[PDB]
Amino acid sequence: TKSDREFAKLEDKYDANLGVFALDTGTNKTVTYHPDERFAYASTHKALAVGALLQQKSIEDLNERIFYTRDDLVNYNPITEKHVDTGMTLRELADASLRYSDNTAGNLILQQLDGPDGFKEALEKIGDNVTLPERFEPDLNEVNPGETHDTSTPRALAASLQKYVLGQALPEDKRALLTDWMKRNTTGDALIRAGVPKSWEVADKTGAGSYATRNDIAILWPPNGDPIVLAILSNRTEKDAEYNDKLIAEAAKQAVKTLKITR
Numbered sequence: 001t002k003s004d005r006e007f008a009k010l011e012d013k014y015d016a017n018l019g020v021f022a023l024d025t026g027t028n029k030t031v032t033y034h035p036d037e038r039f040a041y042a043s044t045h046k047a048l049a050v051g052a053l054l055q056q057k058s059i060e061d062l063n064e065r066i067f068y069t070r071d072d073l074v075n076y077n078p079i080t081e082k083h084v085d086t087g088m089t090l091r092e093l094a095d096a097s098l099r100y101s102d103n104t105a106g107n108l109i110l111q112q113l114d115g116p117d118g119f120k121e122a123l124e125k126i127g128d129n130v131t132l133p134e135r136f137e138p139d140l141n142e143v144n145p146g147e148t149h150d151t152s153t154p155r156a157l158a159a160s161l162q163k164y165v166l167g168q169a170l171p172e173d174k175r176a177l178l179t180d181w182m183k184r185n186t187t188g189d190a191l192i193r194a195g196v197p198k199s200w201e202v203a204d205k206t207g208a209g210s211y212a213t214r215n216d217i218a219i220l221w222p223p224n225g226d227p228i229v230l231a232i233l234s235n236r237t238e239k240d241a242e243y244n245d246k247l248i249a250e251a252a253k254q255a256v257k258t259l260k261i262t263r
Contacts, residue, residue, distance in 0.1 A: 003258040007033040007251065014247040016212065019233040021154035022255040024263060025166060026226025031258040038151040039233035040143035042207030044217045045119075045133065045150075046097045046106050047182060048157075051164035052113055052122035053094065054174040062091040066108055073104050075138045080104035098181040098205060103137035110136060116150075126163050130156035141209035144239075157217050158231040165203060165219045166227055179203055182219070190245035191216040192230060195252030199223050212236035214243030216252075230255055 011018050020033040057064075065087040073081060079096035080088065081104075088096070088105070090112070096105040113119040116133035123131050131152035134140070140150040152160075163169040165179055182203035191214075193202050200222050207215035213235045220228040232251045234243065 003031060003254070004033060006254050006258070010247060010250050010254065013250075014244050016234050016236045016244070016247055018247070018251055019154040019231075020251055020255055021158045021229075021231045022259055023158060023162070023229040024226055024259055025162070025229065027263065029259065029262050031255050032155070035155040036153050038148060038153055039215065039235055040141060040150055040207075040209045040211070040213045041131065041152045041157060041233075042141050042209035042213050042215055043101045043103075043106065044157055044205050044207040044215045044231075044233075045131070045140075045152075046101065046109070047178070047205035047217065048123065048128075048131070048160050048164065049106065049109050049113060049119055050094045050098055050181070051160075051169060051178060052119055053090070053109055054164075054170055054178060055122065056113070057090065059173060059177065062089060062094070064090050066090060066093060068104070068108060072107065074107060074136075076101070076103045078102055080108075094177075095181060098178075099184055099186050101187050101206065107137050116140075123160060126160060126169050128152075128156055128160045128163075131160060141207075141213070142239075143210065143213075145211070154231040154233050157233070158229045161217050161219065161231070162229045166229070179219075188216055188218075191248040192218045192220075192232065192252040194245070194249035196220055196256055197222070207233075208243065210239050212238070212241035212243040214245070214248060216248050228256075228259065 022031040096102040134149035188204040204218035
């Protein structure tokens, strides 16, 4: 299609491979591009894992202080390194995971869910039969082409994010906590946020992994419109390649442009 041609031009421009799924939640109309192709989800899963944590814990239960050690620290611990000698509450861990992409926080949350296997069960319970958690951080970020561990698709990540942020997977109070953390993410300004109008509110979670995997999943609230779900995943040929955030911003801009046509 003509929209396909526009996404293909971005692939050529950035020497990369794109996966896009956008949904207007008012009409159920979509924009797709490789929507059922698997990509390493990288840290985008952290949003879904906090959704699952919120299904398992009351809000007051989020005050539980979790104790961990230097042996739990992995490769990117911006918040958790500072608290190894103090512990962190589950609320604090969710904040760190979602707003900073802290990998030790992400692992501690996975442990609350009974690991990748328990996280997968939680996703299956919301009807996600596509996302396939297997590993902890940091290994989950490295997926060789054709492998399926720690992968999902644009369509499925969008569907699961929608269920948690906009649908009935959580009560309203917990839904608002998740929404607030994702709205106040620190890591996504160059991605979907940079490609959509500045008047829109955005709740997003980024990812980065091997093969220049560079992802962003989001809920968007136009001021005078229905919420939009947007998942953009990408990768490149070489395991050690470097991603370009501008690919994701431009793909978001195109997704919005195409959705406009049929609204």
